[PDB]
Amino acid sequence: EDLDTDNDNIPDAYEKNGYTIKDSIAVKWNDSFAEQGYKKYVSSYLESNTAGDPYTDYQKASGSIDKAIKLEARDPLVAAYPVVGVGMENLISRATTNSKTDANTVGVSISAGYQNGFTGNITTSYSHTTDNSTAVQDSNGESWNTGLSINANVRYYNTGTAPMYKVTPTTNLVLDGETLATIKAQDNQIGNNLSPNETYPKKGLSPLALNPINYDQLKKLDSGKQIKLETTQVSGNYGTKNSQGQIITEGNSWSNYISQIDSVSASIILDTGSQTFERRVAAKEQGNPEDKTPEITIGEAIKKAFSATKNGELLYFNGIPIDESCVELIFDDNTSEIIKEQLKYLDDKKIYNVKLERGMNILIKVPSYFTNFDEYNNFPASWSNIDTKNQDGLQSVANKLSGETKIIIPMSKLKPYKRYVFSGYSKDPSTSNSITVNIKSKEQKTDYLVPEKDYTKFSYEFETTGKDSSDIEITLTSSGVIFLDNLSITELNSTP
Amino acid sequence: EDLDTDNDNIPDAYEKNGYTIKDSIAVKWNDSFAEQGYKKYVSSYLESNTAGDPYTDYQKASGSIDKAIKLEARDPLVAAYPVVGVGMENLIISTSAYINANVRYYNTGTAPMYKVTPTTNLVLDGETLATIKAQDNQIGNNLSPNETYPKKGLSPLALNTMDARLIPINYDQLKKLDSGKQIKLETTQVSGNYGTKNSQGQIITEGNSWSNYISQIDSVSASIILDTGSQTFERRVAAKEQGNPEDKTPEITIGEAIKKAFSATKNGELLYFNGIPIDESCVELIFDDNTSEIIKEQLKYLDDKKIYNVKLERGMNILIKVPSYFTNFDEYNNFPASWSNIDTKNQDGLQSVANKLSGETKIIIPMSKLKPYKRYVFSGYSKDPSTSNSITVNIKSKEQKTDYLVPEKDYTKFSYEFETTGKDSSDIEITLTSSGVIFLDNLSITELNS
Amino acid sequence: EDLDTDNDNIPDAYEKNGYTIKDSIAVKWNDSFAEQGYKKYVSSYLESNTAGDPYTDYQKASGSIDKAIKLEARDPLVAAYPVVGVGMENLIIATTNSKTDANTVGVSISAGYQNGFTGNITTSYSHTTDNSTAVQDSNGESWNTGLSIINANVRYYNTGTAPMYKVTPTTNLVLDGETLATIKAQDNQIGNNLSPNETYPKKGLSPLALNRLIPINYDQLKKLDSGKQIKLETTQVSGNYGTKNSQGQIITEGNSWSNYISQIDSVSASIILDTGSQTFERRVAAKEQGNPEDKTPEITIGEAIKKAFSATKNGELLYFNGIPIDESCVELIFDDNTSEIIKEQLKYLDDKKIYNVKLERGMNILIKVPSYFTNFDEYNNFPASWSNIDTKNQDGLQSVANKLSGETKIIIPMSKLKPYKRYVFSGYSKDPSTSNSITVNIKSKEQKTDYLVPEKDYTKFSYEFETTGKDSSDIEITLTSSGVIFLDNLSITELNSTPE
Ligand SMILES: [Ca+2]
Ligand SMILES: [Ca+2]
Ligand SMILES: [Ca+2]
Ligand SMILES: [Ca+2]
Ligand SMILES: [Ca+2]
Ligand SMILES: [Ca+2]
Ligand SMILES: [Ca+2]
Ligand SMILES: [Ca+2]
Ligand SMILES: [Ca+2]
Predict the structure, then answer these.
(1) Which H/E stretch holds residue C19?
(2) What positions does the entry give for Ca(2+) 1 binding (chain B) (predicted)?
(3) Which residues of B touch C179 (CB under 8 A)?
């Protein structure tokens, strides 16, 4: 075991089967290393840069890279890749917020039930975190025509795993479908450095200010739509070591690698609700028989990309459960088609057990409130008539629904002018009971549900209107006995 | 031995344990070296730049770096890191309207910065007036630590160019300035260089950019700030990654970190900066949420129950605010106004002696030596073996404070937050009462934010 | 020996002790070399550049550097450092400039000095780049005449030991507190060459016109009218140094002097010598106090002065181009920290001389030679002769004294003094009987009288007197004693210029 075909100081056999770096030397992987904290790395023995990034497999695995790079990008399959966008703080004035997911979720259709095996949803307008949508937070029904009777505050963000140096973004002013001009940061709106999961200017500093609109767009802006600001391209550099040991970011353009990484990877986005992450994971092309990129499943990709913890069987991200049945998976058309085609040949019927291919797009939307009756409950109020003396749950226990259960959801906790979906898993062994669900919202809707012998997922939509309004009431009425588990509420796009 | 994994001219065995530099070559540490002035250095044996700065462990330890770098940054665990800001001295508006301001750059780090080009924000109330970047006319060639540009004894430089003349667009914001508002100045980013010696021996600061190292240093270190009331120092000390078994960064406590970072002397047990006590009980410690949580979690597993014995961790933020007036009844008393009901015959103090109080203590503080319109706190430690007396405070301030405190069997610290407003207002009255006989020690007064 | 730790072509044993360069190679020092004119060099054996300048110890000692560098900087302990400032000599909406006014404005003169410390203390110690100009065109009229409700003439100067190439000063144009604008030479006010002790343009050339138009307020105009204290601050200067290359050519292109300014200022002590007309600024390297690995040699203050200013030691007293610059023959001015260090260090010395105190890092020293000084031994530069002088004595401070019994008068014409300037009259007196008394009278703009009592040994006394106008009464100084008194080393030193 001494061959090095790609010449990156890792033997072919070790890199094919499994290796780890100890004392700056690659060693064969042994299962006893897991408790000591070492991780099992695998990469391609024919290419020195498996993920397509500036750093080779040895440099990533051994940590011999910039120390500002996230520890997730030390896996050869996870690329070091900045994701820089621009978000609007104020416009001129009234305070506004921004969302990196609304454009992705605006085009998802929610149905009452889900088909066999497949659990996630399908979007028609999949977008990345660089697309940003503005939402006015200081609106009280007034229009923008008042006052005038007829600059801009921005703050760059990084959702990638690598820092970008000398950031020069280019953004388009989208007048709800119209473009004034393309604007490029000339000399004073350049960020010298922008670490992952941080903004420029840093938190605690005033939003950046950079140096007109017609009544037709004012009428559009006043009625139901808000301006959006998205980046067409960003130019920046990366750091590498000299022969004298210095770090240089000059001539090291990130644009030399944008196209290569994007074409050998699969895009995955995780949205915790407060902070958002976007990762690229390398995959192999199907036709080529000389492509030696390791093949891993979707759950392994999630664990490697987001450094989730495998506490038993379910993955946990900083304590938040991100398991297949605890989140809302959103794919585009092609990825959903591939997953559905691959699921019929798999007896497990799990999305996370499906092999990861290049070109797939996955979005994970973590619920705002989720309960599983085992260890996790973050609902603002406790559900009524909770039964836990059962051992027939989806994972550990379930809820023995016999009668009526209600939940009190204050309007203050939920963001106004937003679209939500209520989801959960239900099972009825007798297959002779009916479920009636009523949601109290701006519009009251009544829907009937027929559970099956095994666990199935249901979903119902509702919207919240107005900061000052009535509470939200959800009730579950059962004719007989119904098994309930893994109830959750996720936040979809905003509404006019 | 002679094994050098990282190739930085220090053997791995020497780095794992202590080592020191004698005659520009590394040697094993011996306890007899401390009496001759030599210092004990420990660093990671798997990396050449433990702290993340442009200088390796051997260069820092042996002093083979720029001589303008402070001696604190000669320790491999303390980073050589400039902290450059801008401070506004005068503000001028005149005629539309032309804005000129008088500023002066500051450096609170351990390394000089060359060719300083700061960027600062002009904000009056949330809204940024403009983003200003210095031009060739107002770039500082040299900015040494603990020094300003221009140096002391020179007039502050004026900033009135935006290459041009700066001019606000609308007048409503300028008119709102008179409506009880002010202009704020904060530093967004600063450009600059560091010196390295080339193959001919000359110092070069041309291709060397400090921005190539900001993200890396800020990511592998902990931030500590020491404020003595007159001059402020900000330091970065390297810490290890929690989940990495291959991270060989040495692990040190908070007191060791402070001693290394600020070159504080230690006479037996206490820590002195320049004769100013900076001990755990002699200053005010301020932490953010995460650092406070880590410290509280780690304290319950430690018998001594001291902040300075808690292991330093990556990402922690510590602020040390040295009290302006501090007395310990032993060797230091700069209080302008004497106390009441004082009996100095005791031996049950925190370090040497204490003060015997029987009843209540009230202090009338003259405000002549006090800076107007600043929040203050009066702090100290109290002892009560009986655990049967209650302590309450009667405080005269903007909002009158009446709170209750229960002394413990051992020494306990009392500090109550209050806001003082009005120079031409009523005198500040502070009253504290105890039911029985109590022992009090380490009394101090500290300025805070206003 | 042969060991060379720092790789600068001089053995460590040679650097720890003295050494000298003969035939471009270092040799061990011998006491007999002083006759041939050779000098004894010491440097740090762990450092190539002891002084912190771009030139190593061997390059400095062997003289293999730019030939425009003064022989003072041939010593490895004396840094090759340019001190470039801007001076103004013409006002446009005829003028002299003093480079040691900010230092002497804050010095307070007292009659008596504590035993051992025969020096003064300043409050606003500044360097020769901080320059103040005094207008002499006005004879009593204000600037408001003629115009009521932009290009000035300047000339750079160098008081260092190294030439500056491609000089680009950044002068701070501050009138009184308020800074109107900060300006910097761009293309036509850049000096290609500026040798030490030289100006740009040269002495026989007209001053260059300073660079659009800057508004001037009116209140500051009458502020100048009340008192003329216009200042011309130089915040920074850009320039290059010359070094040889592989071809053998002198190169001054990427050789920025700013790469070395912070390093030199951090490992050295600043000393300024003012010789009445010309002013010199030097930097001498010193050691770190708490560093066992710092091998910089330790020298005293007198040794540092002799090394830095190339003074000649004629016996035991230092001489600078004939002018005596000994401790008792000049006016030493320190700042607070240097003064307290010297005061602490004197009480552990038997001799109790400032020149015997070890030089330390961060020290600031200013030397101002008196305008008129006599010692009754060989030097007497007063325009007139002191009356009632008894040269035949042996109890003098160095050789002889002035046996005083009665009254002493000196005539001093006003044309020999610069008007509107604060002055100091100083000397040493001693009375073995410890019973007589001395009274003095100074005839100046104010009639001031002070009393003085001598001691068993010599004790310096200092008194103030000012001048006003070019046409006024002559300055008369009276020395009156009851019994017999010994006087020696009488001097008059010119301090700052008083406001109009
Ligand atoms: Ca390989
Ligand atoms: Ca490979
Ligand atoms: Ca469950
Ligand atoms: Ca090593
Ligand atoms: Ca090391
Ligand atoms: Ca005590
Ligand atoms: Ca040598
Ligand atoms: Ca040497
Ligand atoms: Ca004499």
Answers:
(1) strand C19-22
(2) 4, 6, 8, 10, 12, 15
(3) 102, 155-158
